[PDB]
Amino acid sequence: GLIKSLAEKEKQLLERLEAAKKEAEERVKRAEAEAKALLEEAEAKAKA
Amino acid sequence: KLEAILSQEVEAEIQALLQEAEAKAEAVKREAEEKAKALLQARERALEAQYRAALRRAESAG
């Protein structure tokens, strides 16, 4: 039992959260962009 | 031990959040397919209309 266990474990718990929030937003991001580009293909196709 | 508690408060949130955001990334994408399909369903009817009208006009004209 040293304070180092929980100390240097806490500063990893924070990295695990950060990647969580990142790759949540970087996933939805893809889908929103992919929704736009799909409906452009549906306009491009539809008028032609 | 005590560091094993710490890894379990995180490991729980980081699946709750990432399961939630893979069902918004599903949901937007499901509505995006169902819209493009429907903007082409209205395009399909329109063309038909224009052809049924068109032929009747040319029959009358002649």
Curated annotation (Swiss-Prot), chain B:
Belongs to the V-ATPase E subunit family. Produces ATP from ADP in the presence of a proton gradient across the membrane. This is V-type ATP synthase subunit E. It comes from Thermus thermophilus (strain ATCC 27634 / DSM 579 / HB8). The lineage of its organism: Bacteria, Thermotogati, Deinococcota, Deinococci, Thermales.
